[PDB]
Structure formats: structure tokens, C-alpha cells
């Protein structure tokens, strides 16, 4: 037996919260020295604590943390429970999940923020000049529009 339009019903079943802490879910660390890193949830130790593991791409090593310090993202990889770091590197790159996060709004805002913080004196002036130019054109168009 299989589902044809009951498929649609299950699909638009709007659960009150998503993102279960199930193995292979993407997470943004909110607290401690490794805060601001992205990481995968590998294992679940106990009701409080989980084993998190960065990708070797994202660069925080395998370690136990309390669940309270993570903020889970939509995205998840299909990895086995057993998984260790080599298989994780091969898989994470292959299915391109980080790219999906970057394309997502919060990731996009994150990359803009990191640049904006790091921006040099010339760049800071440049944005002002461009914005000022934009204001001139925009104000002129509004004045025209009447």
C-alpha cells in the first residue's frame, strides 16, 4: 500500500515545532568559547547532554556539550548514528548542506554581518557615498512621482 493524495495531507501537516535533536541535525552554538560556530549533532548522551561535532570544514572538534547551548537549524543530513569524523567529512561536503544554510536567510545575514564587522576605513566611507547617491536618486524620483 502507498499514498497518493494522503501524501499531500502529511506534507502540509503543520507540526507546532520542527527540528528534533535527532542525529545529523545542524546547530549554531550560542554559548562558551566555541560560540558562533556551526556544528552537527552526532550523539545524545542523556536528557541534558549531547555530543556535538563540527565539520572539519566548520572547525570545532568533537566534544560533549549541554543541549542548552545550541540553536538548531532546519537542515539535517541523513547520516548513521554510528558516524565518526572521516565519514562525516565525506558526507557533509557531498550533500552540500552548509551551502544550503548559507543560502538560507539567517546564514546570508550571518555572512554579511561578518564582512560588515571586518570592513576597512575606505569601505565604510564607500557605503556612505553609495547610500548618499541612492538617497539623491530616490528622493528625486519621489518628488517626480506626484
Amino acid at each position: 500500500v502507498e499514498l497518493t493524495e494522503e501524501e499531500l495531507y502529511i506534507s502540509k501537516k503543520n507540526l507546532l515545532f520542527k527540528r528534533f535533536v535527532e542525529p545529523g541535525r545542524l546547530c549554531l552554538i550560542e554559548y562558551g568559547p566555541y560560540a558562533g560556530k556551526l556544528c552537527f549533532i552526532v550523539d545524545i548522551v542523556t536528557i541534558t547532554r549531547v555530543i556535538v561535532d563540527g565539520a572539519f570544514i566548520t572547525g570545532v572538534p568533537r566534544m560533549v556539550i549541554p543541549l542548552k547551548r545550541l540553536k538548531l537549524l532546519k537542515e539535517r543530513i541523513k547520516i548513521n548514528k554510528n558516524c565518526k569524523s572521516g565519514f562525516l567529512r565525506k558526507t557533509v561536503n557531498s550533500t552540500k548542506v552548509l551551502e544550503e544554510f548559507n543560502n538560507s536567510k539567517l546564514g546570508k545575514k550571518m555572512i554579511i554581518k561578518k564582512k560588515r564587522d571586518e570592513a576597512t576605513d575606505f569601505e565604510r566611507f564607500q557605503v556612505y557615498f553609495a547610500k548618499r547617491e541612492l538617497k539623491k536618486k530616490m528622493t528625486t524620483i519621489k518628488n517626480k512621482k506626484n
Partner: protein, 185 residues
């Protein structure tokens, strides 16, 4: 401490159910009942197409487990009410003086007269949605009926409380109005 607790509640044939963020609403043949649950943690999920309601709890404790059972039973009563109204049969008992039951105001306000010969009237207005009818059958029966399991019971309780005597042995003096039979219409 425990991770998951669940319960699965069938929905009868006639009901129109419609939950939303713990504001449960049931409509049916005999009127619409709304009954809030947003005081409670609970992941109520709806299932209109195939019927049934699923109550699921995350990270319960025995208090939470008790609550899940409480919510589901109460919801089932609401379905029962809209499908087929609750009839509470109340027999009016007297040893001596004949207790006079006058129903007015379109099956609202039962006025009770002559209790133990007191020559004074006891008026007990009903809850909204609550019919107070009299039986056609046995003379002292009085029907309290409605859609809401709570309101009919409270009306019955109010009637019962309103009547009974003071400062006489309650072993001996039995006169007053009592709940016989819990049924549906």
C-alpha cells in the same frame, strides 16, 4: 522523569472539531462548545481528514501524565455532549410536606416552594445552555439536560445545595432533591 507520553482519541461521526493553539472548539447537532486549555503544556494535534485527535507530551513528569489523561477525557465528554445531550435525572424526595416544583422562564429558573413547610420560595437560576424540564413519567423526577457536561452538573449541584435543611439530624430528615441517573437524551 520520562521522554514521551501520548494518547489517541477517536472522534464520533457527527462532530465538527476545530482546535487551534489549545483553544479547542467542538460544534455539532446540539450547539457549539469552546473550552480553553492554554493553561497547560501540551502538543495537541488535530486530524480532521481521517478523524481522531492525538495528544502528545514532551518530557513529562507524572503530573503531566495525569494532565494528558484529564484533557482527553474532558474532550471526549465535549464530543459526547454535542452528539447526544446529557440528561441528569433528579428525583425530588419528601417524607412529609409535598415539595412544589414550578418551572418557568422557558425551562430556566426552577422555583422550589414549600420545602419542609417553610412557606418561602427558593429560586435557582440555571447555567446558560441548560434545560430544566420535568419528567412526564414519575411525578417527582426533574430533568436537568444540556450539551455541556460541566454546566448541567453545576446546575444540578446548585439545585441540590439550594434545597437541603439546617440544624436537624440528617440521618433522620431526608427531604430534598437528589441526583438519581446520569444518562443522555
Amino acid at each position: 522523569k520520562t521522554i514521551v507520553s501520548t494518547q489517541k482519541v477517536l472522534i464520533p461521526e457527527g462532530v465538527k472539531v476545530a482546535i487551534n493553539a489549545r483553544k479547542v472548539t467542538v460544534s455539532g447537532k446540539y450547539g457549539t462548545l469552546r473550552r480553553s486549555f492554554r493553561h497547560l503544556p501540551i502538543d495537541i494535534r488535530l486530524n480532521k481528514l481521517k478523524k481522531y485527535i492525538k495528544v502528545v507530551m514532551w518530557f513529562g513528569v507524572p503530573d503531566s501524565l495525569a494532565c494528558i489523561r484529564t484533557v482527553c477525557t474532558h474532550l471526549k465528554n465535549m464530543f459526547t455532549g454535542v452528539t447526544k445531550k446529557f440528561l441528569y435525572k433528579m428525583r425530588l424526595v419528601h417524607a412529609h410536606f409535598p415539595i412544589n416544583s414550578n418551572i418557568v422562564d422557558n425551562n430556566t429558573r426552577i422555583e422550589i416552594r414549600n420545602y419542609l413547610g417553610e412557606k418561602s420560595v427558593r429560586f435557582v437560576k440555571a447555567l446558560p445552555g441548560v434545560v430544566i424540564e420535568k419528567s412526564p413519567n414519575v411525578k417527582d423526577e426533574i430533568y436537568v439536560s444540556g450539551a455541556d457536561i460541566e454546566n448541567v452538573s453545576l446546575t444540578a449541584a446548585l439545585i441540590h445545595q439550594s434545597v437541603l435543611c439546617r440544624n436537624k439530624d440528617i440521618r433522620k430528615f431526608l427531604d430534598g432533591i437528589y441526583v438519581s441517573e446520569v444518562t443522555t437524551v
